Amino acid sequence: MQDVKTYLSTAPVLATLWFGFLAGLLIEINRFFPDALVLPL
Amino acid sequence: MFLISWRGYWQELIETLAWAHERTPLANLVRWKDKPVALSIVQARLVGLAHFSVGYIFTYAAFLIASTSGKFG
Amino acid sequence: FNRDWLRKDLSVIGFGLIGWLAPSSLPVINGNSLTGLFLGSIGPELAHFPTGPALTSPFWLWMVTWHVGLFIVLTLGQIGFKGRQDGYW
Amino acid sequence: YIGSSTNLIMVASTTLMLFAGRFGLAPSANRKSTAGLKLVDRDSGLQTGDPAGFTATDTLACGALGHVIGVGIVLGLKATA
Amino acid sequence: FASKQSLSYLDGTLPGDYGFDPLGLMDPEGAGGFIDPQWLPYAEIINGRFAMLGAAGAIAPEVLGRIGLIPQETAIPWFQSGVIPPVGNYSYWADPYTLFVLEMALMGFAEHRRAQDYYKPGSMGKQYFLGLEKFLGGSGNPAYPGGPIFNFLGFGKNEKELQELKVKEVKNGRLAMMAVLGYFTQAIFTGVGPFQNLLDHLADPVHNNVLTNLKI
Amino acid sequence: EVKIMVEKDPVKTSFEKWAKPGHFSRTLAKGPNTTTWIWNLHADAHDFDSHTNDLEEISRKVFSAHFGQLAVIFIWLSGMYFHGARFSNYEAWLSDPTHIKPSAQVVWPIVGQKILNGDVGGGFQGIQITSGFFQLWRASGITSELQLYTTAIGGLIFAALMLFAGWFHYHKAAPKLAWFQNVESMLNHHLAGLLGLGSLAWAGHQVHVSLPINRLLDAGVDPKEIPLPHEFILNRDLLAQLYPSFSKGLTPFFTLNWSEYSDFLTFRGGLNPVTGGLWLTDTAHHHLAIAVLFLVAGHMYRTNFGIGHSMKEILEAHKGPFTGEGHKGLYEILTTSWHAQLAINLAMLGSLTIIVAHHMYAMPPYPYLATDYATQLSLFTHHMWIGGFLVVGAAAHAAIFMVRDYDPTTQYNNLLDRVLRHRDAIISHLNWVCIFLGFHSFGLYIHNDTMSALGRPQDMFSDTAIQLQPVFAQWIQNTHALAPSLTAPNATASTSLTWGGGDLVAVGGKVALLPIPLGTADFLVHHIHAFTIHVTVLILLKGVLFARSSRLIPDKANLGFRFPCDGPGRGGTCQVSAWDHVFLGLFWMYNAISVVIFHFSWKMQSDVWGSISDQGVVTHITGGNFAQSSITINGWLRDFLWAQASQVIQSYGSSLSAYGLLFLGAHFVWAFSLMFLFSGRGYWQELIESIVWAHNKLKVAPAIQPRALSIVQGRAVGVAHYLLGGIATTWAFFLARIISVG
Amino acid sequence: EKYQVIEPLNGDPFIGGFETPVTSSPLIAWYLSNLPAYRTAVAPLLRGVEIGLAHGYLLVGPFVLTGPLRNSAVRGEAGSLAAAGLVTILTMCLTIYGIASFKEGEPSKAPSLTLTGRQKDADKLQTAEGWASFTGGWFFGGLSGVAWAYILLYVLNLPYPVK
Ligand SMILES: CCCCCCCCCCCCCCCC(=O)OC[C@H](COP(=O)(O)OC[C@@H](O)CO)OC(=O)CCCCCCCCCCCCCCC
Ligand SMILES: CC(/C=C/C=C(C)/C=C/[C@@]12O[C@]1(C)C[C@@H](O)CC2(C)C)=C\C=C\C=C(C)\C=C\C=C(C)\C=C\[C@@]12O[C@]1(C)C[C@@H](O)CC2(C)C
Ligand SMILES: CC1=C(/C=C/C(C)=C/C=C/C(C)=C/C=C/C=C(C)/C=C/C=C(C)/C=C/C2=C(C)CCCC2(C)C)C(C)(C)CCC1
């Protein structure tokens, strides 16, 4: 299990997880707050 | 063609061509004075850039002149 | 270089001619009959060469088949000799 | 159908192929043909009760070739005649 | 002693050994996976015993119906009982899929236990089963467990009678395997039960064979 | 001799090596020092023969990796079937094939993506697809989504099975080297089973399922009312109602009365008038005949049972007085090196794929495929590109074999040595052929351009001016058109409608196929094709033949297969390796295939495809301008690229906007590749030095030292981005134009 | 099975080239040896005369049948003039080549050894005076051949299949 954790810490896997989470967050934000051109605050 | 393909390919091809010329009847009667070789690396870059620039200039000059003279407006 | 590189037999010609004319002549109105007829049916040959046959003619197919068969038979006959005496089997 | 021409052709083809197999008139498992078609002897580790060396592999091969030749002959004769 | 060459590894110690191996499947030179020489005899015995059961049970109901022991509502052929609903179906106390689940549960217990005894010979008689682990320790050869359940009458007390019984088992098993294959093929070609096929071949042997049934 | 030989538990299953990124290589395992290590790791991953020296491990790795690729393909097929079962209008299309556009991809509403969901018909919104899966499913007899869902589940199960098989045969029971070298047994088993039995099984499926269902569909029966496929097996009365010869059973088969089955095993040419596709009864007789032929062919080679041919003796027998030892020594090469087998198989597979493209446009095998112009264009272009890539790979891996696995001891006076001994003559004569073809074809085009510009159209090489007719192709067309009367009398019609003889097939007011005239322009364009193909062959063959040595570099085989140069000496030795020859052959293959697909698109749109109205008058998409406008380069530029790109550049704001976006993006990527192609490594290394100083000034320099891409990597990146850009540009252009006007 | 046709050039494996049916063959060798170019003992002027005659005669057809004036009433004259101009340009090329290649003192460059090892006098064509004489002969012969072809084609009728 230690070897699995070491493999999951490699650069491509971590990059995939991080960019997937970031893309999901941005997609959900644009789903709930669409067509945002200027910052209201 | 000069920009992408480099020298060794052309040098070997010219070697085969020289072998062919030296072994052809009625053509051995004619001999070159200078041994044919491929262009130099820097010379190849320069010739590629020259063909490139001439094509660029001529193409845009033709387009500009024609597209402005067909209408004159 | 051997002067007679193509080791001269010159009797393979007759054997090839016979062994190609025997099969081709067999079928009804098929084989060398067509080539012979078109050799005869030149056209207005009273003086010289009547203009060549058009695309829409069977002469081309018949001549192609006949000469292809003749050349195949001749080559296999030449290999049959000169290959039996050199070994190879 | 038993006395029909097709049955006779098929049985004759199969029988002739088997006959040419068992007796040295055709290649088989224990009798290899060379480049000159000479039928030299070949030793295979197959045991058979036939004293001439005819095995079950040869039986299957000769029967298959006989069925093939018989079918071809029957169809050709039907198409021509 | 019969069939093909003596392959130099089928010496004859196995029951039913006649040196029949044209494809050399049991050659111990490269013998990994399921082609191990210690797995093939066991697998032959297992498909053989299941084939004996299958042949007897696929021919029994129709014969019993012809004699009259069982109601004619249950004298249906083997393929009209629920194995193939598109061909025929019978209504039991449960739908066939619940029956399949229950059957898979019971056979899963039995078969995973038998597998664990094959792979770990001494096991299945150590951990606490519901009191029956005492009789479930297979002695020696995995294919012949024995004991107070699997051999509860005491046959083959001496070695020679046991050899004869093993040989008899192998032959009846091979015969039943071929019989089951025949059941399948004859069901496909004729569309009736194997017993009806037997009666048809008996009534008119020359006009009721495989050559006649080429048209279905 | 031939037997199963395996080893038990060779490699233990663990995750330890998953944490050692470069374990397979003895130099990469030590870890990285520069950024070159990452590229070397991802570049040497699947190059098994460079890691070890024993053929056994290489063979086992190849077997398991091929299992993995099979599993990936099964996942892909399952995905296609599922996405067609749940996100498609396949049933509505089944009802009305000629008006409903196929669609199997649906996009989510997120950022305005809604506009891509087009109005394809059938109360459905989605992306129109051009893969031709609807036609294939209809030809298979599928009439519901339940069958597609079942097929998807089966595909997933098969993917799992392939994954397990790969794991089993690498980590648990690995075959020995003697198992892989049974080439006679491998050919027997594959040629008989995989081909003949597969074809026989498909013929059985066609006869027992597809013929009745498609017969009912063509008659006019509503898809919902057609009985299910098993009802034609359980009840032969229906199948005898459709094809009466089924009422006889299998008696005609065994009594050799094969003429009784002539109502569903036919030999008729042409296309079905209703659907514009090949008759399925012909497809039945032909998959059956293929099955028989392959099953007979697979019983040829010698094995444990004595009978059969031996390939070594056959190869050693055929030799003559012109070739010395002949084909001797090839058996050991082909049973010892994986790369030679890969080269041969890649060449054959690429050529076969090109043949598939040609035969598939000329004789459309699926119903309602000929009148779906987008599908025809897409399939032709796709499989043509695939074939080109494979034929380039053949030369690449043949050169790899020549550099690595060649052994002069075994090859003394056989064909390989004698080919390597007269290579200068080969390359010289092929150079002359390339120059001759280029001049006497492209100079003809330039001559036409100059005559047209000078106002002398009577001096051109056109149909109205000086003519160049393709008499040989015209004769072949006429001969093939008259076959059903003389040389293939049992045929009803000719093989295809493209031959000169024949008529017009129209399905739903659109032309399916039509006789294709050949004139001066066709002469010019096939001789262009010949020029480009001989040039690509010249490049690749020069790369393969001079891979080990030349006059310039006598010891090229010591430097390896993939090296940048041998220094600026001898005048300069850039790109002397076989890898760079493949690198240039890729560009020339791109050129050739682009010209081929442009020829196909213009000729089809100009002379075959079109709309037909009452009284049988045909109007073509571009109105037959190929014959006059394709004889000049200006004609191509104006009447093909400028005229036909109006659809892709005006697709903004519609459902086709993605095609315009990818058109622009592909022009961009193609331009982007030129910066890798035209430049060198030293400039970028020095610029990286300056940038590294900048990062060092703020204590943020990386531990792994940044390095400029290697020379070979620069060339590879350039060619990859170049090919992607060009092919994607053509993809977007074709799809937009043909979806708009098709 | 030991009989082979292909042989190294003159039996030397280490000289670049092979000796094939195309290269060495009694018919091909006789034909190539009897061409004027390889008649090393004949005066270069007469060899040039024959070569020029043949080339000038063959050149007339392509220029007349294809050309700007091929459909006019002066097609033959225009084609003949074009062929004569090409002959003049090639004569200029021969002259400048001979000037650039040979000097007045060099003995000769042609090989003086036959294949069978015999020693013979080297060809006088590969000399300044020899090349000059050959060039003059080629010019005169080319003009004569062009004139002869023009006369045959148009001065006299002489019907031809294509003409
Ligand atoms: C479902 C399809 C299959 C998926 C993968 C299945 C893997 C099964 C085990 C493979 C290794 C077999 C050999 C064991 C032995 C082995 O690998 O090396 C042996 C090694 C021993 O380590 P120890 O520290 O226990 O012992 C060291 C000795 O020196 C003294 O005891 O590690 C293990 O035992 C770990 C075994 C599990 C390692 C993987 C754990 C995680 C697996 C699953 C990851 C995904 C989880 C997803 C959850 C949703
Ligand atoms: C298990 C089996 C049958 C089981 C049947 C069962 C349970 C039936 C159950 C039911 O019917 C009932 C009772 C009642 C029904 O209502 C329901 C069902 C459920 C339907 C058959 C095996 C059957 C197994 C068979 C037929 C095996 C054949 C093998 C052969 C011929 C091998 C030959 C060779 O392997 C050798 C020996 C040596 C090699 O070298 C060469 C070759 C030639 C390869
Ligand atoms: C024992 C014995 C014997 C013998 C006997 C006998 C009688 C035998 C026979 C045998 C036989 C008689 C065999 C046979 C076989 C056959 C076969 C084996 C066949 C097969 C077939 C096939 C394979 C076909 C196929 C096909 C084709 C090709 C065509 C189409 C269709 C099909 C696909 C089906 C002896 C004398 C020794 C002694 C005494 C006793």
UniProtKB/Swiss-Prot annotation, chain A:
Subcellular location: Plastid, Chloroplast thylakoid membrane
GO term, biological process aspect, one: photosynthesis
Primary location class: plastid
Membrane topology: Single-pass membrane protein
TM stretches of this protein: 7-27
Domain of life, source organism: Eukaryota
Name of the molecule in the record: Photosystem I reaction center subunit IX
Organism this protein belongs to: Physcomitrium patens
From Swiss-Prot, chain B:
UniProt binding sites for chlorophyll a B3: 1, 9
Tree of life domain: Eukaryota
Membrane spanning residue stretches: 46-66
Binding site for phylloquinone: 10
Compartment annotation: Plastid, Chloroplast thylakoid membrane
Family: Belongs to the PsaA/PsaB family.
Subunit structure: The PsaA/B heterodimer binds the P700 chlorophyll special pair and subsequent electron acceptors. PSI consists of a core antenna complex that captures photons, and an electron transfer chain that converts photonic excitation into a charge separation. The eukaryotic PSI reaction center is composed of at least 11 subunits.
Purpose of the protein: PsaA and PsaB bind P700, the primary electron donor of photosystem I (PSI), as well as the electron acceptors A0, A1 and FX. PSI is a plastocyanin-ferredoxin oxidoreductase, converting photonic excitation into a charge separation, which transfers an electron from the donor P700 chlorophyll pair to the spectroscopically characterized acceptors A0, A1, FX, FA and FB in turn. Oxidized P700 is reduced on the lumenal side of the thylakoid membrane by plastocyanin.
Protein name: Photosystem I P700 chlorophyll a apoprotein A2
Organism of origin: Physcomitrium patens
Taxon lineage: Eukaryota, Viridiplantae, Streptophyta, Embryophyta, Bryophyta
UniProtKB/Swiss-Prot annotation, chain F:
PROSITE patterns, sorted: PHOTOSYSTEM_I_PSAAB
Keywords noted in UniProt: 4Fe-4S, Chlorophyll, Chloroplast, Chromophore, Electron transport, Iron, Iron-sulfur, Magnesium, Membrane, Metal-binding, Oxidoreductase, Photosynthesis, Photosystem I, Plastid, Thylakoid, Transmembrane, Transmembrane helix, Transport
Membrane topology, as annotated: Multi-pass membrane protein
EC code: 1.97.1.12
The protein's enzyme class: oxidoreductase
Similarity section: Belongs to the PsaA/PsaB family.
Name the record gives this protein: Photosystem I P700 chlorophyll a apoprotein A1
Native species: Physcomitrium patens
